[PDB]
């Protein structure tokens, strides 16, 4: 069905809204899983704007492909959680 990168594209607003408060922890979780490099993680951790921080993480992760996207979503949903109106 839906590719992880497509999930991120469709849920971009919700992810950006629900992940801001704990974006540091998310960065940490993703560094510890190899999804981010050290420099990537520093660059993102240093952004003072937490919304832009999440927005850029999402883009960075979409650019790395589907596995990276899955990893972000699995970490995301631990803090943010996972009707049929699209039909």
Curated annotation (Swiss-Prot):
What does the UniProt PTM comment say about this protein? Polyubiquitinated by MDM2; promoting proteasomal-dependent degradation in response to apoptotic stimuli.
- UniProt domain CARD: residue ranges: 1-87
Known tissue expression: Highly expressed in heart and skeletal muscle. Detected at low levels in placenta, liver, kidney and pancreas.
Its induction, per UniProt?
Protein expression decreases in hearts failure patients and in response to oxidative stress.
Q: What is known of its domains?
A: CARD is critical for both extrinsic and intrinsic apoptotic pathways. CARD domain mediates a protective effect against myocardial ischemia/reperfusion, oxidative stress and TNF-induced necrosis. The C-terminal domain (amino acids 99 to 208) is involved in calcium binding and plays a protective role in calcium-mediated cell death.
Clinical condition linked: Myoclonus, familial, 1: An autosomal dominant neurologic condition characterized by adult onset of cortical myoclonus manifest as involuntary jerks or movements affecting the face and limbs. Affected individuals can also experience falls without seizure activity or loss of consciousness.
How does this protein assemble?
Oligomerizes (via CARD doamin). Interacts (via CARD domain) with CASP2; inhibits CASP2 activity in a phosphorylation-dependent manner. Interacts with CASP8; decreases CASP8 activity in a mitochondria localization- and phosphorylation-dependent manner and this interaction is dissociated by calcium. Interacts with TFPT; translocates NOL3 into the nucleus and negatively regulated TFPT-induced cell death.
Protein name, entry field: Nucleolar protein 3
Q: State the organism of origin.
A: Homo sapiens
Identify the taxonomic lineage of the organism of origin: Eukaryota, Metazoa, Chordata, Craniata, Vertebrata
The gene from which this protein is expressed is NOL3
Entire-sequence positions represented here? 5 to 95 of 208
